[PDB]
Design a binder for these strands. Structure first.
Lengths: 96, 95, 78, 99, 95, 96, 78, 90
DNA sequence: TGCCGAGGCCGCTCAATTGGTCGTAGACAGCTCTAGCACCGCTTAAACGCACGTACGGATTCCGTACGTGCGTTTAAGCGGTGCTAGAGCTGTCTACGACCAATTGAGCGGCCTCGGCACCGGGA
DNA sequence: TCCCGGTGCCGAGGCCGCTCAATTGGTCGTAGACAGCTCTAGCACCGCTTAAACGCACGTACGGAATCCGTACGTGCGTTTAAGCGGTGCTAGAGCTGTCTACGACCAATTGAGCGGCCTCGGCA
């Protein structure tokens, strides 16, 4: 139960405009590292969403909670960029 | 037309939703939330890959190895703040 | 006119309690812009914990949580 | 005489427990940073929130000065200097300033 | 009669059990879990008070104010590791 | 929802062994600090017990989990003493 | 003896990657001792995460959980 | 050499003696006999230990440079262990 | 130069998806009234700035030795080998235990009162 | 400056009574303990094959000690400032209750993307 294929997909999608001399495949160990990074960041964001739910005293972690958790876990300029592209994805998903 | 395809994401909306449930991070999980969480995770992965390439394009090895991820994590101040305490396996040290 | 609030004798007192004897002149500005960076981080996380609760009055619970976000836990507020 | 009241100062300020930074200037800094740096506006600070901010920030600065005196005393010095604070900020993984 | 009194503890097994259940720490909380957790918390508080008293007898202040607690936490090696990242309101400094 | 009265009780009980034998009241601010200490340590132990349950893949946090969490949060000699006196309390409670 | 197994050149390697030039002959022993203290903390927490699993082998995930417990999250072991 | 070791990623503390170290520490200070170490576990533990000591030496060289010195010495490591929250020895 | 691992195909399968109900979590609206903000003068202590001079940082030399470097010799780390099995892990039964419930009730909270410790103060030593 | 006798303030501490949360017994259901089986992986001794560690010689570059000067930083004083108070006056909004409803859990059915298994060929040793 690993995010191997999905990380491959995001790598390919980002690379369709990155250095296109070749598809910059990720080495197995690098795949393990990225998989563990996704798991660690997902646990961090989900744990912050849990704490934010318990704070606001709600049984559900809505979009508000994952957004505040992404603003806590992933701060700074990259945090705004990632949450903005996440809102883009969410708007695209809900309008369908 | 799964949710991953619908949202423009490549990350598994279903798998993230399942993990969010079985992890018991909360009682309920509004199915609008896993979409956002998968998008944030995909964007983080794309950003880390983007900065690995950004800091490595000089080498042109045409492959990402844990050292590349280490330098990407521990060069730019935002990622350095996110992953300050991380210690990549077989990583090495940031150039 | 913001860090000036953290006046020179304030850093003097802080550091005397900390333990130092003689304080250079650059230390005042450097500790002002270290305290300001610490407050930037803690207040970013605290404003997040507030704006999430759909509020605008930053509570001391929000501050305690924003600090616990950086491992520094406060005892004596909640 | 150049160090006669330093010991009295250190003892007096280590026996007590009050808040060292004056409360209204620190509160003014907190409101100024919330509006200037963050850009968020019309945010109201609960009194206990400014109090916990001030207590934690001054305790962080006090630990920074403990670590700075350690750095100085390690450099066979007596006067903490900006290199001393920069070391106590880089070694102990504190939040480095912007620039 | 009451679970707290029966166990020979001073801490509320009932309140601790309620906090465990409503804190969502797990779906179920085995009946032994709150009694043991109450005992552990009770003994930790007893240990902190003991250390504060031993470091206090010289100062001989009858009460226990946050400065004494900060001294107890910052002096004993094990307690220092337990509460390394613990600031305390009106804590002062541990000589 | 504070552990004020209980901290009073334990303080009085610990006075008994101590040669000081003073009522040894705790100042309001000190009372708040001790209360927050109990809450912080309870959150730490219960969170570690949750993580230990999720690790061992069990829906219940038994005595095993709270004991391992107390062995993680409270390590060393004071940790062994506290877990031992806690086992004493639990044995006394269960035999009734 | 076992601790002395961390050979002097191995410590010189560790320190050269850390960017040191000349290593006073007393740094060897102090590094051995801080590494032993680190491993005592991490191995106590790893043995606790193991003993809780009712098993007698400390697995990679036990060590990773111990390190997460003390602050250093490891990436790339599970 | 600083370059060869800095850029590579190959382990630094020899695997077998460090394995004996971790096994002895668990079997002596912790005193839990009949403890069996998964190979991945000792590998991860060694990776973390060498990474933590490498960061300790980074901070030691920082403190040395700060003392207008070129040779790191025991006071420098004590400072880089005290200023950081690193685990002080026994 | 060949060798094997990143990447691609293959077929099962298990997890994702959808459609519909029910109930329930929660978004909202309306009311309360706490308390944060503002503001002003006054007190006054705290900050500021400047004069002054001591003492501390740092700049410099210089000697001792504690470092690195460079050999050869010794070693134990690594690896491949098999063999040995404790014990991890997966399953399948069940029962000891926890959730859930209503009803019982008494521990615990706030409200109110008090008096002994202590911040203060002034004295004395 | 310490060390202590009065003084007045206030927070620890005690008592009450209302309340709501804790407790008890009974059903009922199911989580996990416990055993039984399967074989992965750890572990252990062994023997080569090195490559790393080691121990010593050497000598040089560096730590540290010792001195010297300049200036920057502490101390003190008079002047200026604004922190703080506290007291009032204003309202925003935090928060608590109740309502209504959109949404998610859950089940039943469906379906296809993802898993390992298998292959291959070009990047690399």
């Amino acid at each position: 139960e690993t995010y191997a294929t999905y990380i491959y997909k995001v790598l390919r999608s980002e690379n369709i405009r990155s250095e296109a001399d070749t598809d910059l495949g990720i080495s197995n160990k690098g795949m393990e590292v990225m998989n563990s990074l996704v798991n660690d960041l997902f646990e961090r964001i989900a744990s912050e969403a849990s704490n934010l739910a318990k704070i606001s005293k709600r049984n559900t972690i809505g979009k508000k909670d994952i957004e505040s958790a992404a603003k806590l876990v992933i701060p700074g300029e990259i945090g705004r960029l990632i949450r903005d592209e996440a809102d883009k994805a969410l708007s695209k998903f809900t309008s369908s | 037309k799964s949710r991953s395809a619908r949202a423009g994401i490549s990350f598994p909306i279903g798998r993230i939703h399942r993990h969010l449930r079985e992890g018991r991070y909360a009682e309920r999980i509004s199915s609008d939330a896993p979409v956002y969480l998968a998008a944030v995770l995909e964007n983080v992965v794309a950003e880390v890959f983007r900065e690995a390439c950004n800091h490595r394009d000089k080498k042109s090895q045409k492959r990402i190895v844990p050292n590349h991820i280490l330098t990407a994590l521990r060069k730019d101040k935002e990622l350095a703040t996110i992953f300050a305490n991380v210690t990549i396996r077989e990583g090495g040290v940031a150039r | 006119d913001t860090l000036g609030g953290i006046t020179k004798p304030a850093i003097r007192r802080l550091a005397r309690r900390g333990g130092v004897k003689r304080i250079s002149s650059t230390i005042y500005q450097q500790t002002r812009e270290v305290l300001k960076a610490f407050l930037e981080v803690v207040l970013r996380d605290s404003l997040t914990y507030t704006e999430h609760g759909q509020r605008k009055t930053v509570t001391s619970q929000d501050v305690v949580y924003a600090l616990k976000r950086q491992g520094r836990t406060l005892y004596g507020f909640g | 005489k150049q160090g006669m009241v330093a010991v009295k100062e250190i003892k007096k300020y280590q026996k007590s427990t009050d808040l060292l930074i004056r409360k209204l200037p620190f509160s003014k800094l907190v409101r100024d940073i919330v509006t200037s740096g963050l850009s968020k506006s019309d945010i109201r600070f609960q009194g206990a929130a400014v109090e916990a901010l001030q207590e934690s920030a001054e305790n962080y600065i006090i630990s920074l000065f403990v670590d700075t005196q350690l750095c100085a005393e390690h450099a066979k010095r007596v006067t903490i200097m900006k290199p001393d604070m920069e070391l106590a900020t880089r070694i102990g993984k504190r939040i480095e300033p912007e620039y």
